[PDB]
Design a protein around this ligand. Structure first.
Ligand SMILES: CN1C(=O)CNc2ccccc21
Length: 113
């Protein structure tokens, strides 16, 4: 029960804050299927920040949970695909930690709307 425009502004700002935590930009764009040809074997829904931005502007995120769900997918896909001893796996762990703090603060702002 709130106005749509300020909520989308908040999601845009939050998405920028999450991208800032992915310093290697490893989650900025879809995992390249031509470079990882087996990626889709067990990853049923790829996700990345560029796709999240598209979904946001298409009015596909109308509550915080739907936004946070796709962020969690970025993290979970990376934990699932990559072995524990890789930079990619540890990057997803760090993103989960740093991104969760960004998300808690952003949701507190949404609840004030
Ligand atoms: C597996 N993977 C990822 O999980 C994240 N991004 C990426 C870029 C290039 C090759 C592989 C990946």
């Amino acid at each position: 029960e709130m106005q749509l425009t300020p909520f989308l502004i908040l999601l845009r700002k939050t998405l920028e804050q999450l991208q800032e935590k992915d310093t290697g930009n490893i989650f900025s764009e879809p995992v390249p299927l031509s470079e990882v040809p087996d990626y889709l074997d067990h990853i049923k829904k790829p996700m990345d920040f560029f796709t999240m931005k598209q979904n946001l502007e298409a009015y596909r995120y109308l509550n915080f949970d739907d936004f946070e769900e796709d962020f969690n997918l970025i993290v979970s896909n990376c934990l699932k695909y990559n072995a524990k001893d890789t930079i990619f796996y540890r990057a997803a762990v760090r993103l989960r930690e740093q991104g969760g703090a960004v998300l808690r603060q952003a949701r507190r702002q949404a609840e004030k709307m």
